[PDB]
Amino acid sequence: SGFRKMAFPSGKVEGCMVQVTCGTTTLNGLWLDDVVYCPRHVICTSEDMLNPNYEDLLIRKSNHNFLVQAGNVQLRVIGHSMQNCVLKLKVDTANPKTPKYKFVRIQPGQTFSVLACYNGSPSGVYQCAMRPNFTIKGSFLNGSCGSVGFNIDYDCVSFCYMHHMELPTGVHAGTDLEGNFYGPFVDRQTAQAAGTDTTITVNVLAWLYAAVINGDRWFLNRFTTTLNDFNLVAMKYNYEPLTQDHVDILGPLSAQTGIAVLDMCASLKELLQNGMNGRTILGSALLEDEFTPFDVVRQCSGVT
Amino acid sequence: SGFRKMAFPSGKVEGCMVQVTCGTTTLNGLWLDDVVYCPRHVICTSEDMLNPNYEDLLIRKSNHNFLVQAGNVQLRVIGHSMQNCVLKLKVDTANPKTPKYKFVRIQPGQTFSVLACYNGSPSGVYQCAMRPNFTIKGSFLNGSCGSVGFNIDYDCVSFCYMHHMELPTGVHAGTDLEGNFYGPFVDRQTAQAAGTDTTITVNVLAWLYAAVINGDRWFLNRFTTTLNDFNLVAMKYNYEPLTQDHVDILGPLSAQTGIAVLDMCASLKELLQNGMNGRTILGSALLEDEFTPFDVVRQCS
Ligand SMILES: [Mg+2]
Ligand SMILES: [Mg+2]
């Protein structure tokens, strides 16, 4: 028993981290096969950051302007190109530690592990949820840019995120591995803010199931509700609307505990109106929304 | 910006995880050089759990009774000895992925990462602290015995914990890598109870210093306290007493923020008295005790 915010083992990703230098700017890169991926803002200076022309800045830059460091070994850049907001550096040698991988674009509410790096060296790992406003509440200091987010399916690593910048409120913004931003952000040094965040409702429900599986059952009641009744209450408290897709996804948890999703929604509806009244759930005084139903099943219902 | 509970990258440890089998029991082992370390209870059957005579069980075993598997490769056991509650299986092939390592015995309040494994295969990594009652609030299912706890300092992996059992209250007990248990626990199925868990005070103080560094000042007050008066109040809230050692340890954070340890102690005293009042500190509605003074400096500098 027990329940923790668990990250995927990072070993397959650690062997892909490199340091990328251009001028007085050092950030992290992802070395897969003979290509190194990093944020395109590495070619920028303090001047060409307020209004940068990346198209103009890349044509004047040459291969020798990129210092790629894989641990102690130096990698010779034999080409470069841009794909949206990511820079692709073609290198002379293929990464022997390249795992089985794929580039995936995740949806808000989904979770992933982040390997936080500084100068190409992995220093920490933590579990994340993509917020409904398209930001991530991570922990990043300067030099973390180009740190990646991933999920492990079986032997296949799926890269879903690359860090680009921090927003003034402390939240973080980035792209998928094809350079497409998550959210209405630009990779320019300008005033930009995230939209209003909302609670990922289906994730809170999965967590209430994990609590029931671990012996915390005080919030259960005899009552049931409907999707229409629940959503009207949820929208008032800044919660994501619950769809029938969300209900079907909670199925294996509903079957294993003996508490139907609509039965559990009445407990959640009761917690939103009345509060937690001095009590905790899984050692938390706030409703947790950074565990998906799959995370709960993988951690509890199954060994892996 | 941002404050997250972070674990160490588990890569160096993943390459050391193996699967050990004795009879019908399968658990995890730690493969370093030509030795596989694992919980000694792997040699027990159903009727051996209440009162096992390990010396008796081990003498009846030969090397070919232990099946060691590193992925798809079978490892040949050429020797076996017991050291406290850990079994040491000498194998013929040394681990090429052996990192630079040390075995360290930690004290309550110290944090470490746990690589949870099943059938010699890594499943997940998480960060936790050694509770003052010598248990860990981990996340383990059946078959996770042999999963290890570690810290990484530069290129060096410090192995500090090996998982042996879950206590009836849901908490976890284990040994250091020399087989000595943390706490008054034994590897027997008899009724064992962990002492009362208390809050790690020095860790909550370090976390209040991190909140001040990240801008949060709402909980500060114009009061200062004596160490004796603080401990008299804290004991009533199930908080560990603070010692002069804890005060010296907090020195760098005190000098960095300009807030004396006993002045931050008086703010903690008021938080215990009033509650959060709806407010949060570093995104939390409870006082956090699983970040050490060393972890706060490492993440906020
Ligand atoms: Mg109900
Ligand atoms: Mg004060």
Coordinates of C-alpha atoms and ligand atoms in Angstrom, one line a residue:
Chain A
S1 CA 0.0 0.0 0.0
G2 CA 0.8 3.7 0.0
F3 CA 0.5 6.4 -2.7
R4 CA 3.1 8.8 -4.0
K5 CA 3.6 11.2 -7.0
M6 CA 5.8 8.8 -9.0
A7 CA 7.9 9.6 -12.0
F8 CA 9.0 7.2 -14.7
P9 CA 12.5 5.8 -14.3
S10 CA 14.7 8.3 -16.3
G11 CA 17.6 6.1 -17.4
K12 CA 16.6 5.8 -21.1
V13 CA 16.4 9.6 -21.3
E14 CA 19.6 10.4 -19.3
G15 CA 21.7 8.9 -22.0
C16 CA 20.3 11.4 -24.6
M17 CA 21.0 14.7 -22.7
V18 CA 23.7 17.0 -24.2
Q19 CA 24.9 20.6 -23.6
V20 CA 24.4 23.1 -26.6
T21 CA 26.3 26.3 -26.7
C22 CA 26.0 29.3 -29.0
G23 CA 27.7 32.5 -28.0
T24 CA 27.2 33.2 -24.3
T25 CA 24.1 30.9 -24.1
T26 CA 24.2 27.4 -22.9
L27 CA 21.1 25.2 -22.7
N28 CA 20.1 21.5 -22.9
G29 CA 19.7 19.4 -26.1
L30 CA 18.2 16.0 -26.9
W31 CA 20.5 13.7 -28.9
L32 CA 18.5 11.0 -30.8
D33 CA 20.2 9.2 -33.7
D34 CA 22.4 11.8 -35.5
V35 CA 20.2 14.8 -34.5
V36 CA 20.3 17.2 -31.5
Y37 CA 17.0 19.0 -30.7
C38 CA 17.0 22.2 -28.6
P39 CA 14.9 25.4 -28.3
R40 CA 15.6 27.8 -31.3
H41 CA 16.1 30.7 -28.9
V42 CA 19.7 29.4 -28.2
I43 CA 20.9 31.4 -31.3
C44 CA 19.5 34.7 -29.7
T45 CA 21.4 37.4 -27.7
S46 CA 19.9 40.0 -25.2
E47 CA 19.4 42.3 -28.3
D48 CA 17.5 40.0 -30.7
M49 CA 15.1 38.7 -28.1
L50 CA 12.5 41.6 -27.8
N51 CA 11.8 41.3 -31.5
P52 CA 13.9 38.4 -33.0
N53 CA 13.9 37.3 -36.7
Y54 CA 14.9 33.6 -36.3
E55 CA 14.8 33.1 -40.1
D56 CA 17.4 35.9 -40.5
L57 CA 19.5 34.9 -37.4
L58 CA 19.8 31.2 -38.6
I59 CA 21.1 32.0 -42.1
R60 CA 24.0 34.0 -40.8
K61 CA 24.8 31.4 -38.2
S62 CA 27.2 28.6 -39.2
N63 CA 27.9 24.9 -38.0
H64 CA 31.0 26.0 -36.1
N65 CA 28.9 28.5 -34.0
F66 CA 27.4 25.5 -32.2
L67 CA 29.3 23.7 -29.5
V68 CA 27.6 20.4 -28.7
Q69 CA 28.9 18.5 -25.7
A70 CA 28.0 14.9 -24.9
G71 CA 29.5 14.5 -21.4
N72 CA 33.3 15.0 -22.1
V73 CA 33.1 14.2 -25.8
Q74 CA 32.6 17.0 -28.3
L75 CA 30.2 16.6 -31.2
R76 CA 30.8 18.0 -34.7
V77 CA 27.8 19.8 -36.0
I78 CA 27.6 18.9 -39.8
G79 CA 24.3 20.8 -40.4
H80 CA 21.4 22.8 -39.0
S81 CA 17.7 23.6 -39.7
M82 CA 14.6 24.9 -38.0
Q83 CA 11.3 23.2 -37.4
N84 CA 8.8 25.6 -35.8
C85 CA 10.3 26.7 -32.4
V86 CA 12.9 23.9 -32.3
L87 CA 16.4 23.9 -33.8
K88 CA 17.6 20.6 -35.3
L89 CA 21.4 20.2 -35.3
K90 CA 22.7 17.4 -37.5
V91 CA 25.8 15.8 -35.9
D92 CA 28.6 13.6 -37.2
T93 CA 27.9 10.6 -34.9
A94 CA 24.7 8.6 -34.1
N95 CA 23.8 8.2 -30.3
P96 CA 24.5 4.6 -29.5
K97 CA 22.3 5.1 -26.4
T98 CA 19.3 6.1 -28.6
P99 CA 16.2 4.3 -27.2
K100 CA 13.1 3.1 -29.0
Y101 CA 11.2 6.4 -29.2
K102 CA 8.4 8.5 -30.8
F103 CA 7.3 12.2 -30.7
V104 CA 3.8 12.6 -29.2
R105 CA 1.7 15.7 -28.6
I106 CA -0.2 15.4 -25.3
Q107 CA -3.6 17.0 -24.2
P108 CA -4.2 19.0 -21.1
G109 CA -4.9 16.8 -18.1
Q110 CA -2.4 14.2 -19.2
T111 CA 0.7 13.5 -17.0
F112 CA 4.4 13.0 -17.9
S113 CA 7.8 13.0 -16.2
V114 CA 10.3 15.8 -16.5
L115 CA 14.0 15.3 -16.5
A116 CA 15.4 18.7 -15.3
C117 CA 19.0 19.3 -16.6
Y118 CA 21.6 22.1 -16.1
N119 CA 24.4 22.3 -18.8
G120 CA 23.5 18.9 -20.3
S121 CA 23.6 17.1 -16.9
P122 CA 20.4 15.6 -15.6
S123 CA 19.9 16.7 -12.0
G124 CA 16.3 15.8 -11.0
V125 CA 13.1 14.1 -12.1
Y126 CA 9.4 14.8 -11.2
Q127 CA 5.9 14.0 -12.3
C128 CA 3.8 16.7 -14.1
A129 CA 0.3 17.3 -15.4
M130 CA -0.2 19.5 -18.5
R131 CA -2.5 22.2 -17.1
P132 CA -5.8 23.1 -18.8
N133 CA -4.3 26.6 -19.5
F134 CA -1.3 24.8 -21.3
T135 CA 1.3 25.6 -18.7
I136 CA 3.2 23.2 -16.3
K137 CA 3.9 24.0 -12.6
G138 CA 7.5 22.8 -12.6
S139 CA 10.7 23.7 -10.7
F140 CA 13.2 25.2 -13.0
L141 CA 16.2 27.5 -12.4
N142 CA 18.3 29.3 -15.1
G143 CA 20.0 26.9 -17.5
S144 CA 17.1 24.4 -17.5
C145 CA 15.8 25.3 -21.0
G146 CA 15.6 22.3 -23.3
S147 CA 14.7 19.9 -20.3
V148 CA 12.3 17.3 -21.6
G149 CA 9.0 15.6 -20.7
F150 CA 8.4 11.9 -21.4
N151 CA 6.2 8.8 -20.8
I152 CA 7.4 5.2 -21.0
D153 CA 4.9 2.9 -22.7
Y154 CA 6.8 -0.4 -22.5
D155 CA 10.3 -0.1 -24.0
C156 CA 9.2 2.9 -26.0
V157 CA 10.0 6.4 -24.7
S158 CA 7.5 9.0 -25.9
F159 CA 8.8 12.5 -25.9
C160 CA 6.0 15.0 -25.4
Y161 CA 7.6 18.2 -24.1
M162 CA 10.6 20.6 -24.3
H163 CA 11.0 23.5 -21.8
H164 CA 11.3 27.0 -23.4
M165 CA 10.6 29.6 -20.8
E166 CA 9.2 30.6 -17.5
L167 CA 6.2 32.9 -17.2
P168 CA 6.1 35.8 -14.6
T169 CA 3.8 33.9 -12.3
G170 CA 6.3 31.1 -11.8
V171 CA 4.6 28.6 -14.3
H172 CA 6.4 27.2 -17.3
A173 CA 5.9 27.1 -21.1
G174 CA 7.2 24.8 -23.8
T175 CA 6.6 22.9 -27.1
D176 CA 6.2 19.4 -28.3
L177 CA 9.3 17.8 -30.1
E178 CA 8.1 19.2 -33.5
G179 CA 8.4 22.8 -32.2
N180 CA 4.7 23.5 -31.8
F181 CA 3.9 25.4 -28.6
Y182 CA 1.4 24.2 -26.0
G183 CA -0.8 27.3 -25.4
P184 CA -0.9 30.8 -26.7
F185 CA 2.8 31.6 -26.2
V186 CA 5.6 33.0 -28.3
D187 CA 9.3 32.5 -27.8
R188 CA 10.0 36.2 -27.5
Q189 CA 11.0 38.3 -24.4
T190 CA 7.6 40.1 -24.1
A191 CA 4.9 40.4 -21.4
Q192 CA 2.8 37.2 -21.7
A193 CA 0.5 35.6 -19.1
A194 CA -1.3 32.3 -18.9
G195 CA -5.1 32.0 -18.9
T196 CA -7.2 31.0 -15.9
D197 CA -6.3 27.6 -14.7
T198 CA -9.1 25.0 -13.9
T199 CA -9.1 21.8 -11.9
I200 CA -8.8 18.5 -13.9
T201 CA -12.0 16.9 -12.6
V202 CA -11.5 13.3 -13.9
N203 CA -8.0 13.3 -12.2
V204 CA -9.5 14.4 -8.8
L205 CA -11.9 11.4 -9.2
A206 CA -9.1 9.0 -10.0
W207 CA -7.3 10.2 -6.8
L208 CA -10.5 9.8 -4.7
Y209 CA -10.5 6.1 -6.0
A210 CA -6.8 5.7 -5.0
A211 CA -7.8 7.0 -1.5
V212 CA -10.6 4.5 -1.2
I213 CA -8.1 1.7 -2.3
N214 CA -5.8 2.8 0.5
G215 CA -8.4 2.8 3.3
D216 CA -9.6 6.5 3.2
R217 CA -13.4 6.1 2.9
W218 CA -14.9 8.8 5.2
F219 CA -16.1 11.0 2.3
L220 CA -18.3 8.3 0.7
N221 CA -22.1 8.8 1.0
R222 CA -25.3 6.9 0.1
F223 CA -26.1 9.4 -2.7
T224 CA -25.7 9.4 -6.4
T225 CA -25.9 12.2 -9.0
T226 CA -26.1 12.8 -12.8
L227 CA -23.5 14.3 -15.3
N228 CA -25.8 17.3 -15.9
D229 CA -26.3 18.0 -12.1
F230 CA -22.6 17.5 -11.3
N231 CA -21.3 19.8 -14.1
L232 CA -23.5 22.7 -13.1
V233 CA -21.9 22.6 -9.6
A234 CA -18.4 21.9 -11.1
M235 CA -18.4 25.0 -13.4
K236 CA -19.2 27.2 -10.4
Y237 CA -16.0 26.0 -8.6
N238 CA -13.7 26.3 -11.6
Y239 CA -13.7 22.6 -12.4
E240 CA -13.4 21.0 -15.8
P241 CA -16.7 19.6 -17.2
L242 CA -17.0 15.9 -16.8
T243 CA -17.8 14.1 -20.1
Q244 CA -19.1 10.6 -20.8
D245 CA -15.6 9.8 -22.1
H246 CA -14.3 10.6 -18.6
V247 CA -16.9 8.4 -17.0
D248 CA -15.9 5.3 -19.2
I249 CA -12.2 5.9 -18.4
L250 CA -12.8 5.6 -14.6
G251 CA -14.5 2.2 -15.3
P252 CA -11.7 -0.1 -14.0
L253 CA -11.6 1.9 -10.7
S254 CA -15.4 1.9 -10.4
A255 CA -15.4 -1.9 -10.9
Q256 CA -12.5 -2.6 -8.4
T257 CA -13.9 -0.6 -5.5
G258 CA -17.6 -1.1 -5.9
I259 CA -18.3 2.7 -6.1
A260 CA -19.8 3.9 -9.4
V261 CA -18.5 7.1 -10.9
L262 CA -21.8 8.9 -10.3
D263 CA -21.8 7.7 -6.8
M264 CA -18.3 9.2 -6.4
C265 CA -19.3 12.5 -8.1
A266 CA -21.8 13.0 -5.2
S267 CA -18.9 12.8 -2.7
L268 CA -16.9 15.3 -4.8
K269 CA -19.9 17.6 -5.1
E270 CA -20.2 17.4 -1.3
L271 CA -16.5 18.2 -0.8
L272 CA -16.7 21.3 -3.1
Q273 CA -19.7 22.8 -1.3
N274 CA -19.1 21.8 2.4
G275 CA -15.2 21.6 2.3
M276 CA -12.9 19.0 3.9
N277 CA -13.9 20.0 7.5
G278 CA -10.6 19.5 9.2
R279 CA -10.0 16.1 7.5
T280 CA -7.4 15.1 4.9
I281 CA -7.5 12.6 2.0
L282 CA -4.2 10.6 1.4
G283 CA -2.4 13.1 3.7
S284 CA -3.5 16.1 1.6
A285 CA -5.8 19.1 2.6
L286 CA -6.4 20.1 -1.1
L287 CA -8.0 17.9 -3.8
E288 CA -5.2 16.5 -6.0
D289 CA -5.6 16.7 -9.8
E290 CA -2.1 15.5 -11.1
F291 CA -2.8 11.8 -11.3
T292 CA -4.8 10.4 -14.2
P293 CA -6.9 7.2 -14.0
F294 CA -4.1 5.3 -15.8
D295 CA -1.5 6.5 -13.2
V296 CA -3.8 5.3 -10.4
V297 CA -4.3 1.9 -12.0
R298 CA -0.6 1.5 -12.8
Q299 CA 0.4 2.5 -9.2
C300 CA -2.4 0.5 -7.4
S301 CA -4.5 -2.1 -9.5
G302 CA -1.4 -3.4 -11.4
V303 CA 2.3 -3.7 -10.3
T304 CA 3.3 -1.8 -13.5
Chain B
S1 CA 10.9 29.6 -9.9
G2 CA 8.6 26.8 -8.7
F3 CA 9.1 24.3 -5.8
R4 CA 8.6 20.6 -6.6
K5 CA 9.4 17.5 -4.6
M6 CA 12.1 16.1 -7.0
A7 CA 13.8 12.7 -7.1
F8 CA 17.3 11.9 -8.4
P9 CA 17.8 10.6 -11.9
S10 CA 17.5 6.8 -11.5
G11 CA 19.7 5.8 -14.5
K12 CA 22.8 4.8 -12.5
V13 CA 20.6 2.6 -10.2
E14 CA 18.5 1.0 -13.0
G15 CA 21.6 -0.8 -14.4
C16 CA 22.1 -2.5 -11.0
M17 CA 18.6 -4.0 -10.5
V18 CA 18.3 -7.8 -10.8
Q19 CA 15.7 -10.4 -10.0
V20 CA 16.5 -13.1 -7.3
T21 CA 14.5 -16.3 -6.9
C22 CA 14.6 -19.0 -4.2
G23 CA 12.0 -21.7 -4.4
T24 CA 8.7 -20.0 -5.1
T25 CA 9.8 -16.5 -3.8
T26 CA 10.9 -13.8 -6.3
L27 CA 12.2 -10.4 -5.1
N28 CA 14.8 -7.7 -6.3
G29 CA 18.5 -7.7 -5.8
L30 CA 21.2 -5.0 -6.1
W31 CA 24.1 -6.1 -8.4
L32 CA 27.3 -4.2 -7.6
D33 CA 30.7 -5.6 -8.9
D34 CA 30.4 -9.5 -8.5
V35 CA 27.9 -9.3 -5.5
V36 CA 24.1 -9.4 -5.5
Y37 CA 22.5 -7.9 -2.3
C38 CA 18.9 -8.9 -1.4
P39 CA 16.7 -9.3 1.7
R40 CA 17.5 -12.6 3.5
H41 CA 13.8 -13.5 3.9
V42 CA 14.0 -14.7 0.2
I43 CA 15.0 -18.1 1.7
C44 CA 11.7 -18.4 3.8
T45 CA 8.7 -20.6 3.1
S46 CA 5.1 -20.1 4.5
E47 CA 5.7 -21.8 7.9
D48 CA 9.1 -20.0 8.3
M49 CA 7.7 -16.4 8.6
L50 CA 6.8 -16.4 12.3
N51 CA 10.1 -17.7 13.7
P52 CA 12.7 -18.2 11.0
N53 CA 16.0 -19.7 11.9
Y54 CA 18.0 -18.1 9.0
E55 CA 21.3 -19.8 9.9
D56 CA 19.4 -23.2 9.7
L57 CA 17.6 -22.2 6.4
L58 CA 20.8 -21.0 4.8
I59 CA 23.0 -24.0 5.7
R60 CA 20.5 -26.2 3.8
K61 CA 21.0 -24.2 0.6
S62 CA 23.5 -24.6 -2.2
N63 CA 24.5 -22.1 -4.8
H64 CA 22.3 -23.6 -7.5
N65 CA 19.1 -22.9 -5.4
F66 CA 19.4 -19.2 -6.2
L67 CA 18.2 -18.1 -9.6
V68 CA 19.6 -14.6 -10.4
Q69 CA 18.4 -12.9 -13.6
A70 CA 19.7 -9.6 -15.1
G71 CA 17.1 -9.1 -17.8
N72 CA 17.3 -12.1 -20.1
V73 CA 20.8 -13.2 -18.8
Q74 CA 21.1 -15.8 -16.0
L75 CA 23.9 -15.1 -13.5
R76 CA 25.8 -17.9 -12.0
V77 CA 25.9 -17.9 -8.2
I78 CA 29.4 -19.1 -7.0
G79 CA 29.1 -18.2 -3.3
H80 CA 26.7 -17.1 -0.6
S81 CA 26.9 -15.5 2.8
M82 CA 24.6 -13.6 5.2
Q83 CA 25.4 -10.2 6.7
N84 CA 22.7 -9.2 9.3
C85 CA 19.4 -9.1 7.4
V86 CA 20.9 -9.0 3.9
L87 CA 21.9 -12.0 1.8
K88 CA 25.1 -11.6 -0.4
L89 CA 25.2 -13.8 -3.5
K90 CA 28.7 -13.9 -5.1
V91 CA 28.2 -14.1 -8.9
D92 CA 30.7 -15.1 -11.6
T93 CA 30.2 -12.0 -13.8
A94 CA 30.9 -8.5 -12.5
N95 CA 28.3 -5.8 -13.4
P96 CA 29.8 -3.6 -16.2
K97 CA 27.3 -0.9 -15.3
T98 CA 28.5 -0.6 -11.7
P99 CA 28.6 3.1 -10.9
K100 CA 30.8 4.8 -8.3
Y101 CA 29.1 4.0 -5.0
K102 CA 29.2 4.1 -1.2
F103 CA 26.9 2.5 1.5
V104 CA 25.6 5.1 4.0
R105 CA 23.4 4.7 7.1
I106 CA 21.1 7.8 7.3
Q107 CA 19.4 9.5 10.3
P108 CA 15.6 10.4 10.7
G109 CA 14.7 13.5 8.7
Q110 CA 17.1 12.6 5.8
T111 CA 15.6 12.4 2.3
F112 CA 16.3 10.0 -0.5
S113 CA 14.9 8.7 -3.8
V114 CA 13.3 5.2 -4.0
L115 CA 13.5 3.2 -7.2
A116 CA 10.5 0.9 -6.9
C117 CA 11.1 -2.4 -8.8
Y118 CA 9.1 -5.6 -9.6
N119 CA 10.7 -8.8 -11.0
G120 CA 14.1 -7.0 -11.3
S121 CA 12.4 -4.3 -13.5
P122 CA 12.2 -0.6 -12.6
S123 CA 8.6 0.7 -12.3
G124 CA 8.9 4.2 -10.8
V125 CA 10.9 6.7 -8.8
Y126 CA 9.9 8.9 -5.9
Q127 CA 11.3 11.1 -3.2
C128 CA 10.7 10.5 0.5
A129 CA 12.1 11.1 4.0
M130 CA 13.1 8.7 6.8
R131 CA 10.5 9.4 9.5
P132 CA 11.6 10.0 13.1
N133 CA 10.0 6.6 14.0
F134 CA 12.4 4.9 11.4
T135 CA 9.7 4.0 8.9
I136 CA 9.1 5.4 5.4
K137 CA 5.7 6.4 3.9
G138 CA 6.5 4.8 0.5
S139 CA 4.4 3.2 -2.2
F140 CA 5.0 -0.5 -2.5
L141 CA 3.1 -3.5 -3.7
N142 CA 3.9 -7.3 -3.2
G143 CA 7.2 -8.2 -4.9
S144 CA 8.8 -4.8 -4.3
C145 CA 11.1 -6.2 -1.5
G146 CA 14.7 -5.4 -2.5
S147 CA 13.9 -2.0 -4.0
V148 CA 16.5 0.5 -2.9
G149 CA 16.8 4.1 -1.6
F150 CA 19.6 6.3 -2.8
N151 CA 21.2 9.8 -3.0
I152 CA 23.5 11.0 -5.8
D153 CA 26.3 13.4 -5.2
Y154 CA 28.2 14.2 -8.4
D155 CA 29.1 10.8 -10.0
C156 CA 28.7 8.9 -6.6
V157 CA 25.6 6.9 -5.7
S158 CA 25.0 6.6 -1.9
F159 CA 22.8 3.5 -1.2
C160 CA 21.0 4.1 2.1
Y161 CA 18.0 1.8 2.2
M162 CA 16.7 -1.6 1.0
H163 CA 13.0 -2.4 1.3
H164 CA 12.1 -5.5 3.5
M165 CA 8.5 -5.2 4.6
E166 CA 5.2 -3.3 5.1
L167 CA 4.0 -2.7 8.7
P168 CA 0.2 -3.3 9.5
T169 CA -0.4 0.5 9.6
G170 CA 0.7 0.8 5.9
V171 CA 4.2 2.2 6.5
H172 CA 7.4 0.6 5.3
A173 CA 10.5 -0.8 7.1
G174 CA 13.9 -1.8 5.8
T175 CA 17.7 -1.9 6.4
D176 CA 20.8 -0.1 5.4
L177 CA 23.1 -2.0 2.8
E178 CA 24.9 -3.8 5.6
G179 CA 21.7 -5.5 6.6
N180 CA 21.0 -3.5 9.8
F181 CA 17.4 -2.4 10.2
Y182 CA 16.4 1.2 10.7
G183 CA 14.3 1.0 13.9
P184 CA 13.4 -1.7 16.4
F185 CA 12.1 -4.0 13.6
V186 CA 13.0 -7.6 12.8
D187 CA 12.4 -9.7 9.7
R188 CA 9.7 -11.8 11.4
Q189 CA 5.9 -11.9 10.7
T190 CA 5.2 -11.4 14.5
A191 CA 3.2 -8.3 15.7
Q192 CA 5.5 -5.2 15.3
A193 CA 4.5 -1.7 15.9
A194 CA 6.1 1.5 14.9
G195 CA 6.5 4.3 17.5
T196 CA 4.4 7.5 17.1
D197 CA 5.3 9.5 14.0
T198 CA 6.3 13.2 14.6
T199 CA 6.8 16.2 12.3
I200 CA 10.4 16.8 11.3
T201 CA 10.7 20.4 12.6
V202 CA 14.1 21.3 11.1
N203 CA 12.7 20.3 7.7
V204 CA 9.5 22.5 8.1
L205 CA 11.8 25.4 9.1
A206 CA 14.0 24.9 6.0
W207 CA 10.8 24.9 3.9
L208 CA 9.6 28.1 5.6
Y209 CA 13.0 29.6 4.6
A210 CA 12.4 28.5 1.0
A211 CA 9.0 30.2 1.0
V212 CA 10.6 33.5 2.1
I213 CA 13.3 33.1 -0.6
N214 CA 10.4 32.6 -3.2
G215 CA 8.6 35.7 -2.0
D216 CA 6.0 34.5 0.7
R217 CA 6.2 36.7 3.8
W218 CA 2.6 36.6 5.1
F219 CA 3.4 34.2 8.0
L220 CA 6.4 36.2 9.4
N221 CA 5.9 38.0 12.8
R222 CA 7.7 40.5 15.0
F223 CA 8.3 37.9 17.7
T224 CA 11.4 35.9 18.7
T225 CA 11.4 32.9 21.0
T226 CA 13.9 30.9 23.2
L227 CA 14.7 27.3 22.1
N228 CA 13.2 26.0 25.3
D229 CA 9.9 27.8 24.9
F230 CA 9.7 26.8 21.2
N231 CA 10.1 23.1 22.1
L232 CA 7.5 23.3 24.9
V233 CA 4.9 24.5 22.3
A234 CA 6.1 22.1 19.5
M235 CA 5.9 18.9 21.6
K236 CA 2.1 19.6 22.1
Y237 CA 1.7 19.5 18.3
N238 CA 3.6 16.3 17.8
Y239 CA 6.6 18.1 16.4
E240 CA 10.2 16.9 17.0
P241 CA 12.2 19.0 19.4
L242 CA 14.8 21.4 17.9
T243 CA 18.4 21.1 19.1
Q244 CA 21.4 23.5 18.8
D245 CA 22.6 21.2 15.9
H246 CA 19.4 22.0 14.0
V247 CA 20.0 25.7 14.6
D248 CA 23.6 25.6 13.3
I249 CA 22.5 23.6 10.2
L250 CA 20.0 26.3 9.4
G251 CA 22.7 29.1 9.6
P252 CA 23.2 29.6 5.8
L253 CA 19.4 30.0 5.2
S254 CA 19.2 32.4 8.2
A255 CA 22.1 34.6 6.8
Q256 CA 20.7 34.4 3.2
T257 CA 17.2 35.8 4.1
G258 CA 18.3 37.9 7.1
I259 CA 15.9 36.1 9.4
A260 CA 17.3 34.5 12.6
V261 CA 16.4 30.8 13.3
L262 CA 14.6 31.7 16.6
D263 CA 12.6 34.5 14.8
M264 CA 11.4 31.9 12.2
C265 CA 10.6 29.5 15.1
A266 CA 8.2 32.1 16.5
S267 CA 6.5 32.3 13.1
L268 CA 6.1 28.5 13.1
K269 CA 4.6 28.6 16.6
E270 CA 2.0 31.1 15.3
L271 CA 1.2 29.0 12.2
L272 CA 0.5 26.0 14.5
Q273 CA -1.8 28.1 16.7
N274 CA -3.8 29.8 13.9
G275 CA -3.7 27.4 10.9
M276 CA -3.3 28.5 7.3
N277 CA -6.6 30.6 7.2
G278 CA -7.2 29.5 3.6
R279 CA -3.7 30.6 2.5
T280 CA -1.0 28.4 1.1
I281 CA 2.8 28.3 1.3
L282 CA 4.7 27.0 -1.8
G283 CA 1.4 25.7 -3.2
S284 CA 0.6 23.6 -0.1
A285 CA -2.2 23.7 2.6
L286 CA -0.1 21.8 5.1
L287 CA 3.4 22.4 6.6
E288 CA 5.9 20.3 4.5
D289 CA 8.5 18.2 6.4
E290 CA 10.2 16.2 3.5
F291 CA 12.7 18.8 2.3
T292 CA 16.0 19.0 4.3
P293 CA 18.1 22.2 4.7
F294 CA 20.5 20.8 2.2
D295 CA 17.6 20.1 -0.4
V296 CA 16.4 23.7 0.0
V297 CA 19.8 25.2 -0.9
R298 CA 20.2 22.7 -3.8
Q299 CA 16.8 23.7 -5.3
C300 CA 16.7 27.4 -4.4
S301 CA 20.3 28.3 -5.5
Ligands
MG1 MG -22.1 8.5 -2.9
MG2 MG 9.2 36.4 14.4

